[PDB]
């Protein structure tokens, strides 16, 4: 079995800057990953894994998807929920 | 569908006395978690997840198994690998 984003918790960020939300994902109903950032980079919204700067100047994620596909399956879930919070709130407005 | 820690890779093993190994586990063949470390505490060994610092200054795991059995599993998966490497290491010298 492949792994599965099974839940997303998300907090919208309203301070301007690039970052639009910070979230956690639940993998397999079981494992939670914190500090995932939703960002407006000059090419569309994208999801960054929690990352660590090396004493080296450089950067690696603490939590790394191996394929770009599983990356995208993490990204989709987070962007989906994000936008879904957008338009459940919108519809509430009346 | 639960957790499957499919693989445990074990870097930096046995230099500091307390900080015993540095570990990368792979979940479900696709998702890797770095900077897990094997530390020797009060009662022997335990596996520490990577630490997030919250806004009030407390330290929390970035990587958090909600249930304790999942934690056990993860811990056992890591410790068996650490224990295996070392005892295989010694078995080299005997032969």
């Amino acid at each position: 079995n492949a792994m599965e984003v099974t839940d997303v918790r998300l907090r919208r960020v309203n301070t301007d800057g690039r970052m639009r939300a910070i979230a956690s994902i639940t993998l397999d109903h079981e494992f939670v990953v914190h500090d995932i950032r939703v960002i407006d980079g000059n090419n569309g919204l994208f999801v960054a894994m929690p990352s660590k700067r090396t004493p080296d100047g450089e950067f690696r994620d603490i939590t790394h998807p191996i394929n770009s596909s599983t990356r995208g399956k993490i990204q989709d879930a987070v962007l989906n929920e994000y936008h879904r919070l957008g338009d459940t709130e919108a519809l509430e407005f009346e």
Side-chain angles (χ1 to χ4, degrees), chain A:
Chain A
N1 211 57
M3 115 282 11
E4 238 163 332
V5 180
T6 267
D7 201 337
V8 175
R9 193 174 110 105
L10 179 147
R11 203 194 93 216
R12 211 132 48 201
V13 169
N14 325 281
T15 309
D16 197 285
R18 290 282 213 201
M19 159 156 53
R20 302 280 176 275
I22 172 172
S24 55
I25 58 171
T26 294
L27 294 184
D28 317 304
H29 321 86
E30 208 139 316
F31 196 82
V32 167
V33 185
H34 289 291
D35 308 297
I36 296 169
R37 294 118 99 218
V38 184
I39 296 191
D40 199 49
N42 17 4
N43 256 317
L45 254 33
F46 78 88
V47 174
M49 290 309 107
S51 158
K52 166 173 208 168
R53 48 270 156 274
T54 53
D56 202 307
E58 302 222 332
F59 280 97
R60 265 317 218 117
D61 18 359
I62 291 158
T63 257
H64 175 260
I66 312 172
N67 314 132
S68 51
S69 64
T70 96
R71 169 162 257 115
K73 94 169 144 285
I74 280 145
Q75 173 163 298
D76 289 338
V78 169
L79 295 175
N80 277 169
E81 178 62 14
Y82 174 67
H83 288 134
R84 192 188 140 285
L85 284 216
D87 77 5
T88 313
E89 205 193 73
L91 75 82
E92 166 282 343
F93 208 85
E94 318 82 56

